[model samples]
Target chain A: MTDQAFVTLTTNDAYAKGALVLGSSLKQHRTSRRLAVLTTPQVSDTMRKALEIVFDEVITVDILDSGDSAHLTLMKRPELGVMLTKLHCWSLTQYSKCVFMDADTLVLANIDDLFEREELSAAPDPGWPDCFNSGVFVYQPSVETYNQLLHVASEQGSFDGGDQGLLNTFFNSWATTDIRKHLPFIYNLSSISIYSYLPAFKAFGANAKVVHFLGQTKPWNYTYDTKTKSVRSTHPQFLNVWWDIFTTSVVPLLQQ
Target chain B: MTDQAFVTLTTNDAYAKGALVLGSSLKQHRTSRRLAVLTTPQVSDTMRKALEIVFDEVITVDILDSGDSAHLTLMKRPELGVMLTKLHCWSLTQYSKCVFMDADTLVLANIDDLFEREELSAAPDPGWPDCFNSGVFVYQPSVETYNQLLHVASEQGSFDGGDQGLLNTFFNSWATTDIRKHLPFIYNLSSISIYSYLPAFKAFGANAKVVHFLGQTKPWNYTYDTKTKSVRSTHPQFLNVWWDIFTTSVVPLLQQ
Candidate 1:
């Protein structure tokens, strides 16, 4: 049996909603790898039960036990809580190799080829091209590696004091050493800077394969309007796929 | 010596602007008691040094000091963070009595009469009339009272997850039993709901003794345009006073 897989984590119930859509979107794209979700105790009973029906495995873990001393040092850097939550993915060792997807990511196509990559691979951040985005990444899990990560975090606090900062700082060599390590921006596109740089989004946003609502705002929070519909509808292929997935019944079907 | 006073807390340099206006506005109306400011370590050295020139006393204190198991219990209650920051007022034993003001509040008149009330007194929140707003409140300094507050917080977390909630919950008996406890709405008027209910604001908001830029929006963030200015200019007395205080030679004084 193949030991490689994909995993996502949700520390709170509010983020679980995002996890639901992420799982549904990935399944609709018909990816071959095993899909999994790691959840904390505080996640709603409904969310935990619901996610179990869709994912191949639903694993529960404690965030404090993840050996990230950076979390303890977070008192001086209170803003790093989000990063610490993201780092909880490192504890999912059930799969030897895995792609960690953020709960907020929406996959549009089968990305089974991502499992072929080695550990510590990710797409470039949309905001700053030099930094690898933390939303999606390929990794090989091991207890020794996890401990080494904790050591790195304690010695050098994250640059931005969050997951993006910590990941970017740890993978400092990725910027210049390897080109293949950088996934295409389309794989993890963001919508936040669209208002500030509309022209760029207008030009390349249509090709995005996985939409990551990186900032505070999310699509679920918005009341879909005709104007927004028209703009997104311009990308008929993706928009139609998204709408179809959104409207489809969330039923569980066993794999043949 | 006066037994009553006004107090304000500023945690950042940006909020210090709001704090100065609060102190100056209360002083402008010739408040009969001392005006004091509390600051956190993160505040800029220049701003801290500048605040000392304007207020009677500028005290530095750690709002997040979880000294013991009981203190840790208080810290665990998320709602108590802001309330604990507010409760640091009790440590100001220098004054017999004080009114705690959020850095965001702008006092419009002599609110010294607030001290006449007693321990645990506040104005009805304009948004939710039943709950007391935390922006402007009269409190007495006592280590016993502070200890009791810590106990109340650990037992029952704040209702709204902020100081306002903690205050409302701690003074749970006030809503139905005491009439004198309800300070008039004008004492802590907020501008958030006013735009949506302009008529109601015009009818009842005209008598406001203090203005609170509650929520994320604040006067400093808004650009001064003719339309915005014209709407504000409708309340010429209030607008003119705000303009003078905000733009006064205080910038140079702060520099000094």
Candidate 2:
């Protein structure tokens, strides 16, 4: 059997709108690797159906219900809840390797070459360039590596109380040791402090390949100006895109 | 017939620090009217004593137990609970007229001239210059005006969902044709967006007579850099000032 690779994603359904965009955008790019989505049972039936149509597999894995190994490790490292969900990519050993994309991300181009990387590889966050953004990354899944990740998280308290903090702490040597492993900022772009520091954004923001709307306010809450191509409008664009994605039906059959 | 006016400021305790600065600054510039403080039960004994030493009268008004006509107006406009605490300014009818200052404000010069103006006179907000900021304002104390304010609030919803909104809607005419009524922005300078729009702030912020920290994040949250002759510390100066007011030895005087 020929070795195969995949792209994996997650959504708690509360963020299903983001997941939908992530999935649809990936399919639109026509990725050759198998596309998979990991979800909890709480996701709506309608959303699951939509994901099923686009993804090669729609797997339901309860990180909380995965027995004492998962639960105890999670409790000891309460900060690792997000990291644990990301680590679920390891359970899909069905593929030789997989690239994990956070639900909030939108793929602008074909990024299959990401799979050629080793066990763990990701781009640095734009906000804090030293730390890798958990939003997008390439990884080879293994039960041993998953156990090692949990062990590290259980020992060291997360610096910032989130996935990014845990991952940065776990891969302590990432910044100094390897040059090729460091993914460019173009892979994971974020929009924070855009108004406070416009000049920096003007210089670097255009090179972003994927846009990640981090923090409390999502793009859906903000309106966009059509004439100016600006996001500052009376009505939010995310809401408009959400309705457009669900209501509009397009044929899934691959073009010849 | 003598024309005597009253001015009162309220602070939960930490806010009292700002109130003291406002009171002392006003007193230093010599205002003829009587000065008072409306305090809550939680104000420290020391703060109460300090406030008593500064103001002509330190009145302990229970914000939670206000039983005036404004309470009915308050119930009608449940969203204005904070505004209700502010409306307690009307019950101080000992003087024919009264001006209410928020705890976070600082007075640069004598504002006693404001007494000549009728009820509901204030400087326009810096953010939306059309609307008056509730931080500083002049008003005539009457059960009738209080009742009217309550009625307006209950019948029509406020635009911004706070005291500013209710006051602006009630005095809708001020935005259109009132020329003598509009106090200059320099009288009540607010610093909510100084960091976000530094250039605009640098140009206009220096002329402020009374600086109001409107948003949740105050100056005390950041630290100041003393070398720069600017507030450059990690903790915001306003927050530190608020903490000092809440914890200072002056609590006993303010509580009285």
Candidate 3:
């Protein structure tokens, strides 16, 4: 029950590809803590078994689809059914502390020291500095917080209509304090910065410990052309590393 | 004097421009240690004064011209007279320890922790697997080591007739020992890697701490066209960064 864990959520089959690489990358770094994948029924049986081979544990969580109708009309992408399920991470009180990484992230370095952080430690989002990025965050498991989050999500519908907005509202005090609560931007750097500010990306891109292959066009959306020997993507930068891992490790699991 | 320092050497005006950017980039990151620049008489007074403003100490060192007969005939770009002057760093006993970076190198992060690593600590050179890139290194200051380096430089001329070959021979044990003694390639990342391995650079280019404008076309060779607000170079991957630091910080000094 005292076992600590590193967790990632993979809701659908497409995201399961990301979760597979995320899990394998963590194992590749030889993280001392146990690894787990909190998935939903939406992921196929084939992908689930593949995850079982890579992760120490794979626990299925019920999808908490947002029932809000007002925001859903205005929302662009609209499907956040997977984001709410992220709250289930708190109920796993078996672990003292856990780092919740989004499936979209790619780990560049060994990040075992992230365990040293407290309840809500995450790097600020590049898009909006004050609002922390939900892609990667460190938190302690608590049923009370879990109950409170569920209650609040139902009532407020989250101002931004997403987990990021909900979590920011819950962990509102983070901005006021000088707590090591602030993870450096290195942990969750977005690929958009490459286009937004190539100079900034060029300056600090190499230090990215966890790259959030975030945005509309994900690594999964693109296909690797074996003949051309390149993963086709708008963000061609991260394609090779992801392809290197997916081709070498995850592709074999598909054959099995 | 109980002070530690980050030091670089600028042989002449061309390199002094690199030194100016190097010192300014470190200051931009708010490095804890004092900064120093060693230059030979070959550098102009204007450039020397520019280095003085950014650096805490601007000490002049006499050039130990490669009096070697063999390479002198074949060598076309003969200004490396100041290359041997880098050994002057060992004599700067004012600091208990020092990190020596090449003038052509741009600091992308605050590398104060590099101070913890002992003498001869450097990343493996990409050109040769065994030798550490002399672009950046952490070393202790000792008069004895300084004297030994000078004796060796004169008695046994370097095969490549450059500081890298000489220092590799001096710290010959670097290749065989524990790998931590050798830094990860990120610490002294050569810009050439962008060309040699595009995929690898695309994967991890952002994490480079100190981008070495190594090889033939250094950043100083380019003109930061103020009108376009972009620095043009042979290798355009890092020109924006070298340009950013140059325009904001170093350009103002050129006016004075």
**lDDT tens readout by residue for model 1, A81-194:** 556555656766778888888887789778877877777777655323345678888888776766666556666656555566667677676544454565655666654433
Q: What lDDT score goes with residue B183 in model 1? A: 61
Which pairs of residues collide in model 3?
A: A204-B206, A205-B206, A205-B207, A206-B206, A206-B207, A206-B208, A207-B207
DockQ order, best first, reads 3, 2, 1
Question: lDDT by residue for model 1 over B117-217, one digit each (tens)?
Answer: 77666665532333456787778887877777777777766555666666767776543344456565567666553442344355456667887777565
**TM-score-best of 1 and 3:** 3
Worst 10 residues of 2 chain B by lDDT: B233-242
What TM-score against the true fold does each predicted structure earn?
A: 0.47, 0.46, 0.49
Cα error, candidate 1, residue B59 (Å): 1.4
Better of 2 and 3 by DockQ: 3
Worst 10 residues of 1 chain B by lDDT: B226-235
Report, to 2 decimal places, the DockQ of model 1.
0.01
Every candidate's DockQ is: 0.01, 0.01, 0.02
Off by over 4 Å in 2: A1-8, A66-68, A77-79, A193-197, A222-256, B1-256
- Candidate 2 residues B1-256, lDDT tens each? 0234445455466666666766766666677877877776677777677777777778765544545555566666766766765666776677687767776776656777777766677765543333556777877777777677667777875556667777877776553334445555555655654453343344445555666676565544444444443454322544444344333423444544
Worst 10-residue lDDT window, candidate 3 chain B = B68-77
